[PDB]
Write a protein that binds this ligand. Structure first.
Ligand code: 3AM
Ligand code: CA
Length: 114
C-alpha cells in the first residue's frame, strides 16, 4: 500500500523517506550481491504477533529501518541493524508494514509499528 507518512516503532518515529530508503537499500544490496550483515531476511507471518500487512501476497522480506539510511554494515565495519524493520514484497519492493523488536511479546519477536 502507499508508504505511510510516518510510523512509530517503539518510540523511534520514521518518515516515509526513511521507509523508502530502507526498501531501496535492500533492493540495491541484493542486486549488488552485498547484503549488509546478510540483510534482507525473509519475513513470515506469525499471527501471534498481530502484524497486518497492506501489500498482498508473499513472499515477504524484512530489512533494517534506520535514520540517515540506508542501513549498511560490512566485515570491516559492523553496524547493528537496531530493532526496527521494513517489510516489503520480495518480488516487487512494494511496502507491506513496519515492525520492531522493541516491546515485542517474546524474544526475537516482532510487533507492529503504530
Ligand atoms: N514474523 C517474524 N517474527 C520474528 N522474526 C522473524 C519473523 N519472520 C522471520 N523472522 C526471522 O527470525 C529472526 C528473528 O529471530 C529475524 O531476523 P532479525 O531479527 O530481523 O535479525 C528473521 O530472520
Ligand atoms: Ca496490528
Amino acid at each position: 500500500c502507499d508508504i505511510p507518512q510516518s510510523t512509530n516503532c517503539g518510540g523511534n518515529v520514521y518518515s516515509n523517506d526513511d521507509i523508502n530508503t530502507a526498501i531501496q537499500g535492500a533492493l540495491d544490496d541484493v542486486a549488488n550481491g552485498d547484503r549488509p550483515d546478510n540483510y534482507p531476511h525473509q519475513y513470515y507471518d506469525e499471527a501471534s504477533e498481530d502484524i497486518t500487512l497492506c501489500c498482498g501476497s508473499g513472499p515477504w522480506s524484512e530489512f533494517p529501518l534506520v535514520y540517515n539510511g540506508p542501513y549498511y554494515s560490512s566485515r570491516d565495519n559492523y553496524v547493528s541493524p537496531g530493532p526496527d524493520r521494513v517489510i516489503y514484497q520480495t518480488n516487487t519492493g512494494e511496502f507491506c508494514a513496519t515492525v520492531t523488536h522493541t516491546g515485542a511479546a517474546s524474544y526475537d519477536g516482532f510487533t507492529q509499528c503504530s
